[PDB]
Amino acid sequence: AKHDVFPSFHGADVRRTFLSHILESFRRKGIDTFIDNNIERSKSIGPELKEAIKGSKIAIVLLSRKYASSSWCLDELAEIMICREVLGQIVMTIFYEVDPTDIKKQTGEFGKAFTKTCRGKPKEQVERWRKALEDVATIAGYHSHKWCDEAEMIEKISTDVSNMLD
């Protein structure tokens, strides 16, 4: 391995706000977290990114309302789920202002974003994304709606993340 945590997230939803606080809390607890610049990304994930997902003991899927609007995020998710079966890789889920049923069934606004993304995409690739989304929602995780204090929720994420890597 080469990182503790690979974060998978859609930047527009969370990068300025919620993710920034998670990263601050992770470095405070010394959790080695992969970071990647927003501008650089190519049309496909490509090889460097996949090696980072392979190299991470934990993958944290931060699921947000427009996460399905990014083909890049959906490609990250498929690689993470393949890593879960083949490698030991642990997958954690943060349901940020989204219900798992919409993730599981591709329904609601998350489904609408997914439907627009799949327009123009190979049938096998669409099925891989759809299956990964269906699998990912069964992973029990943290729900932003059900925590009164977001700072307190993040501190619990860090505590659980640190416990799994020590």
CA distance 82 to 104: 17
User: How many domains does one find in the chain?
Assistant: 1
91, 84 in Cβ contact below 8 A? yes
C-alpha–C-alpha distance, residues 39 and 130, integer Å: 27
The CATH number that applies at residue 20 is: 3.40.50.10140
CB atoms within 10 A of CB 94: 24
DSSP string, 41-84: --SS-HHHHHHHHHTEEEEEEEE-TTGGG-HHHHHHHHHHHHHH
Experimental method: X-ray
| Residue 60, domain extent | 1-166
Q: Which residues does residue 8 pair with via DSSP β-bridges, in sequence order?
A: 61
Torsion of CA 16, 21, 27, 28, to 10 degrees: 150
Resolution (angstroms) stands at: 2.8
Closest CA to 111 of 76, 71, 143, 66: 66
- Please identify every residue annotated as catalytic: 76
What one-character DSSP code corresponds to residue 134? Answer: H
Three-state SS for 142?
strand
For 31, phi and psi rounded to 5 degrees? -90, 115
